[PDB]
Design a protein around this ligand. Sequence first.
Ligand code: ZN
Length: 212
Amino acid sequence: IAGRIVVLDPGHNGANDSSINNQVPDGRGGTKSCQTSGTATDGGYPEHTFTWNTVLLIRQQLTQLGVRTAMTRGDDNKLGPCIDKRAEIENSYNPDAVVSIHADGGPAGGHGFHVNYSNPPVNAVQGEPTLRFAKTMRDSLQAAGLTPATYIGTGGLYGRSDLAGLNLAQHPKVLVELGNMKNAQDSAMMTSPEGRSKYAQAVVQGIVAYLS
Ligand SMILES: [Zn+2]
């Protein structure tokens, strides 16, 4: 585990302007908006702040394990990089694994996590190396006591073709939606410092399980 390289992507920007509406190539024949604002709990806790703070905790734990780390943004209050640029930044580190951290907006009674991965793969690394990462991450999150999403995906897994950040990956990568910000139980855990710590520990267990 020590000496491996992991890049962490806290989804969305600390702040936005109309540049986020400019269209960028999506890695699968189309274009998508440079960025989207992301969601928030009904208490006003923004997705971008949740992902930022959870990624900081993931990074700290990985560094303590001797894992070399990088992030795709440096703050939670200014414009951050577009989704295609984030994939470029990730790829530039030749990482052994990449984890993007998001939280979702779904029906209020729906809760739990889902691990998004590229399907169908557009290159070889997005095949077995990435599917194994996705299944391993799902297994580790559920073993940590997290609930697979009750409202989307299949048993905590979601293969999809619409996400530029997944389509553009040259290294094993997953995008973990940790929960539904619009749900009472997930919002409480996302808004809790110790909830964010538990999310981060579980993601780290998935990274460790995959790299081993
Ligand atoms: Zn998001």
